C-alpha cells in the first residue's frame, strides 16, 4: 500500500478513536535501526563510537516502487565485470534485504489509518533509504 506505519497506544486492539494511535518509530521495531542493518556493501562504519543510537521515523514503501528500485540495481550488473576489476561494491545491495515486513495500521493520517489495517507491510527508515539510493 502506502503511507506511514501507525501504532496503537495504550492497550492491544483498543483502537477506537483517531486519538488512540501514534506514529511508529525505530525504537518500537529495533530491527530497522542502524546497529542491526546488514552492512553488505560496507556503508555504515564499524566504530562503535560513530553510531547515533537515535531513533527515526518509519515509512511505508509501495508495491509499485520496489519493482522500480530493484531495477535500479540492475543497471550496475551490466558492468560487474569492470566493477570487480575496479574493485567496488563486491556484493550487490539487493534492496529487498533492507526492507522489513511488519503488519499494522498504515496511512497518512491517524484517522484514515485507523480504518486501514494490513498484514505484511514493508517498512524503511529515511536514513537507510538514502544509503541505498546512494
Amino acid at each position: 500500500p502506502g503511507g506511514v506505519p501507525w501504532i496503537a497506544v495504550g492497550d492491544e486492539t483498543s483502537v477506537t478513536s483517531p486519538g488512540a494511535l501514534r506514529r511508529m518509530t525505530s525504537k518500537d521495531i529495533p530491527e530497522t535501526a542502524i546497529i542491526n542493518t546488514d552492512n553488505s556493501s560496507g556503508a555504515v562504519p564499524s566504530e562503535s563510537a560513530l553510531v547515533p543510537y537515535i531513533d527515526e521515523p518509519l515509512v511505508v514503501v509501495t508495491e509499485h516502487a520496489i519493482t522500480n528500485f530493484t531495477k535500479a540495481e540492475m543497471a550496475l550488473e551490466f558492468n560487474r565485470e569492470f566493477l570487480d576489476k575496479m574493485r567496488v561494491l563486491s556484493v550487490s545491495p539487493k534492496y529487498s534485504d533492507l526492507l522489513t515486513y511488519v503488519d499494522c495500521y498504515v496511512g497518512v493520517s491517524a484517522r484514515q489509518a485507523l480504518n486501514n489495517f494490513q498484514k505484511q507491510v514493508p517498512v524503511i527508515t529515511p536514513t537507510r533509504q538514502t544509503m541505498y539510493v546512494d
Binding site: 509501495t62 509499485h64 516502487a65 522500480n68 531495477k71 535500479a72 543497471a75
Partner: protein
C-alpha cells in the same frame, strides 16, 4: 578462458536480439510516495 582473436565466434546481429541495457526507467514521484 574465451579467446577474442581466435575463430569459432559469431557476430550475427538480428532484430530479434536488439541491444538495450537499461535506457531509463520510471521514478515519477506521485507514483512512488
Amino acid at each position: 578462458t574465451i579467446n577474442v582473436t581466435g575463430d569459432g565466434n559469431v557476430f550475427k546481429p538480428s532484430a530479434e536480439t536488439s541491444s538495450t541495457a537499461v535506457p531509463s526507467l520510471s521514478l515519477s514521484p506521485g507514483m512512488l510516495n
